[PDB]
Amino acid sequence: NTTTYDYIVVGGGTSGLVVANRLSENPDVSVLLLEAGASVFNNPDVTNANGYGLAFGSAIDWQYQSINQSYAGGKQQVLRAGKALGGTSTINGMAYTRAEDVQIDVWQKLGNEGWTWKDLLPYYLKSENLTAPTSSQVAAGAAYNPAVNGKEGPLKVGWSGSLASGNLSVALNRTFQAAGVPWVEDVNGGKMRGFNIYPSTLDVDLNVREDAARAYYFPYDDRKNLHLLENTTANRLFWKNGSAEEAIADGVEITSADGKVTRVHAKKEVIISAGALRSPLILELSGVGNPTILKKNNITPRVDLPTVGENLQDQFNNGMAGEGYGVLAGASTVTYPSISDVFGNETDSIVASLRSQLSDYAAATVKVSNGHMKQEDLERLYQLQFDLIVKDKVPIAEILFHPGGGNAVSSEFWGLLPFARGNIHISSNDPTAPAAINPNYFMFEWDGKSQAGIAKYIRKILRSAPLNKLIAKETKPGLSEIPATAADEKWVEWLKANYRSNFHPVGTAAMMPRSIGGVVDNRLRVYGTSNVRVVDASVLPFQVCGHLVSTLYAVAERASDLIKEDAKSA
Ligand SMILES: Cc1cc2c(cc1C)N(C[C@H](O)[C@H](O)[C@H](O)COP(=O)(O)OP(=O)(O)OC[C@H]1O[C@@H](n3cnc4c(N)ncnc43)[C@H](O)[C@@H]1O)c1[nH]c(=O)[nH]c(=O)c1N2
């Protein structure tokens, strides 16, 4: 009847809008989107291509709070997320970069059939429409490889209309030679190491931010089989009652803006796309998760899957600055250094120490999931990551350099692959209550040591020629606070005191085999259910090197094909 649809997609965000778009391509399938926020079509702080940061702390920022971070000096961290049609794509930094090919290949090696770079690449392309650079932008260093960028996809990608060459970016380009990191034409072809003028998620015909709604929703909102409920919060799924021990989702419980708490039903499937900080909570509230936590919070267990909310992996981000003799200008540049780029002469002794620590990191992570992940299993997971870092020389850092205003040069930077793992769990069965989110930042020695290594490497870049002729001094942290010959620990103290979340959480409904603590299968179906999937950052089993939206769009495009395929029987 009147609350029944074929599919229900929970969360009209980065990933959810893809799935809703693709599923509604079949004009005889009905799709309901549920979104807690609303349209931001006309929110200027979203729409503004130069508006990054403006929306922080507003009504469209969930502004989730972590617990005290006991490995990082005790402070709680704000974890930002978009509450809006388009989700976190509405408030993010707009950077478009993907992942290392061999790091996606690891997903299949781990036991997830069909997930490799070769499998995913067509779906990156399918999502994308890249606008080639103008002359001004080419002189500023903009480039791309036509073979790895799409031209028909919903997500417009391009460079700023204001991009121009300037003394800072020109000097940086040459100074990177001294540092040993080559220029590359396109970081998005599976090999990310180098430095590059990366494109952004931007509509250059409007000069607006290209969020997921501008891409996958508004051009398609004429489809009468695609339905949207804004200001509508999904609280939990409910189930079909009947002695199928395997759980069949019947629908979703929802709260509307003006108070009505009701149900909507799905004839085929329910797709959960609320993000890595909410999808696992929705599962827990629906009885899918750790039965000890569920029972404690007065929820009946429906599926005993105790790693829902576990294996949370995030990065942390720090910032450095210097000051020119005069005004610094030009492009914003990304660098993706490997372990040997960052540590140079000392790489092999750094690698040996790391090697010698893996089993201890694994032993220590066991207690985080109260023994639900076994030591053996964490050792094998950490070995896959170690082998990427060292054997395959994937990038271990992102470093952004940009003009900071007038005299200023600013660098933002993060380690890509820390080993720390945490979790997120409901604090009660009230959907409106804040979860306990613990990413465990700085838990393991590598996580801090690598960040300090990156900082030391930036400091050296700023002092290298020809860039050094432009730069009078370092202003942050500056030599007074952290002297030129300072030890790793001196850096780690400062970085701990000054870090923020990089807002890249993954893993909270991980796609791995159930036997090593997976929550979803290789077709993104929740274990123990017939017809529930998770399609968002929750399912990435490991961190990726680049900025998340590109990979999340690709995963949602591929997921969509799998869902369609599965329907051509049932
Ligand atoms: C400040 C900042 C800056 C950056 C980034 C993040 C942040 C916070 N990122 C990361 C990237 O933007 C992010 O990982 C993805 O947008 C996440 O997409 P998801 O689909 O997983 O969740 P996303 O958060 O997009 O979608 C979840 C949706 O579910 C909704 N929702 C949640 N709970 C619900 C409920 N119970 N009921 C109904 N709806 C619900 C939310 O409101 C939201 O619309 C980024 N990436 C990048 O590629 N380039 C960049 O430059 C940056 N920079």
In a domain, 307, yes or no: no
The residue whose CA has the least distance to atom 51 of ligand 1 is 93
CA of 86 to the centre of ligand 1 (A): 8
| Single-letter residue type at 37 | G
Q: For residue 271, what is the enclosing H or E element?
A: strand 261-272
Look up residue 503 and give its two tokens: 């807002």
In a domain, 214, yes or no: yes
How many CB atoms within 10 Å of residue 243?
A: 4
In a domain, 388, yes or no: yes
Give CA separation, 36 vs 183, 230, 431, 568, 570, in Å: 43, 6, 12, 31, 30
Q: Which of 263, 534, 548, 552 to mutate to test the pocket of ligand 1 (most atoms within 8 A of CB)?
A: 548
The residue whose CA has the least distance to atom 44 of ligand 1 is 87
Look up residue 207 and give its two tokens: 């000069």
548 lines ligand 1 (CB under 6 A): yes
The residue whose CA has the least distance to atom 3 of ligand 1 is 92
* Residue corresponding to tokens 């082998």: 387
First to last CA, the chain: 20
The residue whose CA has the least distance to atom 18 of ligand 1 is 14
CA of 566 to the centre of ligand 1 (A): 27
In whole angstroms, give the CA distance from residue 83 to residue 35: 8
The ligand 1 atom nearest the CA atom of 505 = 14
CA of 460 to the centre of ligand 1 (A): 34
Q: For residue 208, what is the enclosing H or E element?
A: strand 208-209
CA of 13 to the centre of ligand 1 (A): 6
Give CA separation, 559 vs 92, 351, 521, in Å: 23, 37, 11
Q: How many domains does the chain have?
A: 1
Look up residue 290 and give its two tokens: 């750790």
Q: List all residues 6 or more positions away from 60 whose beta carbon is below 8 Å from its beta carbon.
A: 37, 40, 43, 45, 46, 82, 83, 84, 90, 91
CA of 41 to the centre of ligand 1 (A): 16
The ligand 1 atom nearest the CA atom of 538 = 21
402 a catalytic residue? no
In whole angstroms, give the CA distance from residue 163 to residue 420: 37
| Single-letter residue type at 72 | A
471 lines ligand 1 (CB under 6 A): no
Phi/psi at 114 (5° precision) = 95, 0
- E strand intervals along 273-382: 288-289, 303-304, 310-312, 316-324, 333-336
504 a catalytic residue? yes
CA of 531 to the centre of ligand 1 (A): 24
In a domain, 226, yes or no: no
Per DSSP, helices labelled H in 180-334 are: 212-216, 279-285, 291-296
In a domain, 510, yes or no: yes
The ligand 1 atom nearest the CA atom of 233 = 37
Which among 235, 272, 242 has a CA at the least distance from the CA of 519?
Answer: 272
How many CB atoms within 10 Å of residue 257?
A: 12
Which among 417, 407, 408 has a CA at the least distance from the CA of 383?
Answer: 417
The residue whose CA has the least distance to atom 40 of ligand 1 is 11
Binding-site residues for FAD, in ranges, read 14-15, 35, 62, 88, 92-93, 95, 234, 537, 549
User: Hey, CA dihedral for 504, 460, 492, 396, is it positive or negative?
Assistant: positive
In a domain, 89, yes or no: yes
Q: Which of 88, 211, 256 to mutate to test the pocket of ligand 1 (most atoms within 8 A of CB)?
A: 88
Å resolution of this model? 1.8
117 lines ligand 1 (CB under 6 A): no
In whole angstroms, give the CA distance from residue 487 to residue 523: 47
435 lines ligand 1 (CB under 6 A): no
What is the CB-side half-sphere exposure of residue 459 using CA atoms within 13 A?
19
Range of the domain at 409: 16-30+32-43+81-221+312-567
Look up residue 511 and give its two tokens: 């796609």
According to DSSP, residue 434 is labeled P
Give CA separation, 239 vs 187, 267, 287, 527, 532, in Å: 44, 12, 10, 15, 11
Cα Rg, the chain, nearest whole Å: 23
Per DSSP, helices labelled H in 180-278 are: 212-216
154 lines ligand 1 (CB under 6 A): no
In whole angstroms, give the CA distance from residue 154 to residue 177: 37
CATH number, domain of 361, equals: 3.30.560.10
According to DSSP, residue 22 is labeled H
280 lines ligand 1 (CB under 6 A): no
Q: 413 near 398, Cβ under 8 Å?
A: yes
According to DSSP, residue 100 is labeled -
Prior bond to 541 cis, omega within 30?
no
In a domain, 277, yes or no: no
Give 78's strand partners.
65
Experiment type: X-ray
Look up residue 151 and give its two tokens: 């031209």
88 lines ligand 1 (CB under 6 A): yes
In a domain, 229, yes or no: no
